[PDB]
Design an enzyme around this catalytic site. Structure first.
Site, PDB file in Angstrom:
ATOM      1  CB  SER A  38       8.496   8.551  -0.230  1.00 53.62           C
ATOM      2  OG  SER A  38       8.712   7.871  -1.446  1.00 53.62           O
ATOM      3  N   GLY A  55       5.088   7.189  -6.957  1.00 49.14           N
ATOM      4  CA  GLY A  55       3.784   7.054  -7.565  1.00 49.14           C
ATOM      5  C   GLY A  55       2.832   6.450  -6.562  1.00 49.14           C
ATOM      6  CG  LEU A  56      -1.314   7.200  -7.118  1.00 47.82           C
ATOM      7  CD1 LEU A  56      -2.456   7.162  -8.118  1.00 47.82           C
ATOM      8  CD2 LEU A  56      -1.775   7.823  -5.782  1.00 47.82           C
ATOM      9  CB  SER A  57       0.139   2.541  -2.581  1.00 51.93           C
ATOM     10  OG  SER A  57       0.667   3.463  -1.638  1.00 51.93           O
ATOM     11  CB  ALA A  58      -2.250  -0.001  -6.365  1.00 55.49           C
ATOM     12  CB  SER A  59       1.533   3.384  -9.565  1.00 62.40           C
ATOM     13  OG  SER A  59       2.757   3.289  -8.852  1.00 62.40           O
ATOM     14  N   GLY A  60       2.151  -0.005  -9.399  1.00 62.24           N
ATOM     15  CA  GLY A  60       3.100  -0.978  -9.882  1.00 62.24           C
ATOM     16  C   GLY A  60       4.547  -0.581  -9.705  1.00 62.24           C
ATOM     17  CE  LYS A  61       4.695   3.381  -4.661  1.00 61.23           C
ATOM     18  NZ  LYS A  61       5.648   3.681  -3.564  1.00 61.23           N
ATOM     19  CB  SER A  62       6.429  -2.590  -5.435  1.00 64.79           C
ATOM     20  OG  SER A  62       7.181  -3.550  -4.715  1.00 64.79           O
TER      21      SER A  62
END
Lengths: 164, 164
Positions: free
Chosen positions: B96, B22-29
């Site tokens: 990615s 997902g987008l870098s700031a989507s909260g995936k981390s």
């Protein structure tokens, strides 16, 4: 995010690297496989890093020159450390004839902020360089595979990495 | 030596890779860290592969060109597979952006003789390419971090990877 000591507490084990060193036919590979199986019998997380799962996946780009040989040990050392950070007993018997080979991997562990134990195990059997002060010294003329597994497991328990 | 099915039986879990895209700031981390912690609370082995433990140890030799960027995802894919082979829930939210990035790592898993599941998780929040048929689709405007952790955890249980 979870801290290292909390991960170890939650999972019931501390991670480490068990690096079996010795002559190519000393039986270090057989002991590595038996140790892994025994620890899995205790329901402990343990994983063997060997030429099959590593040399043709992660390390398929490496050849056989001196440079490739050192980079192989470097990568194995780093991967071993990752497994130990995950609280797994990482076990390897990878070919590594020089004292400086094992030293490369040992420093990765000791210099880490988790101070992960590096447990060098000399499988000593009748141009390899032997370790000077290995954590464990097993003489093959005196001990069978099951006895070598027992000495190593007892070391792990005695040093607080696995439950007694 | 121990077989894959025996390891899973002895350890009470099957390995896999959860790949959060997902987008870098989507909260995936943030989700990747919460998922890991929740699984450790269940006393399950789970490990996050992220830029901190990987980019400056295993991958310190890689720069920032396209080639280095692809080699980085390749190595992470392979290390993730090793974790899954050890019966660990390997979790990554690594950068990615392309469909072909996640495809490289998926093939490593599906082509393995262990047929390790690759669980691509689209964290969809308001030049990234989104996945077409991801295993899990989580919309950020509908679910909070704890519900996304619950949706993912239930998928693992529903598919036989962790006990219910």
């Amino acid at each position: 995010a979870v801290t290292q000591d909390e991960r170890d507490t939650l999972l019931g084990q501390k991670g480490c690297t068990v690096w079996l060193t010795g002559l190519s036919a000393s039986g270090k590979s057989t002991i590595a496989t038996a140790l892994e199986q025994h620890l899995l019998h205790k329901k402990l997380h343990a994983y063997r890093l060997d030429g099959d799962n590593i040399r043709f996946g992660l390390n398929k780009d490496l050849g056989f020159d001196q440079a490739s040989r050192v980079e192989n040990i470097r990568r194995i050392g780093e991967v071993s450390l990752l497994f130990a950070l995950s609280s797994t007993i990482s076990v390897t018997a990878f070919i590594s004839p020089y004292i400086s080979d094992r030293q490369l991997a040992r420093e990765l562990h000791e210099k880490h902020s988790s101070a992960i134990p590096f447990i060098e195990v000399f499988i000593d059997a009748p141009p390899y360089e032997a370790p000077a002060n290995p954590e464990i010294h097993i003489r093959t003329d005196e001990v069978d595979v099951a006895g070598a597994v027992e000495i190593i497991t007892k070391y792990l328990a005695d040093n607080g990495l696995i439950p007694a």
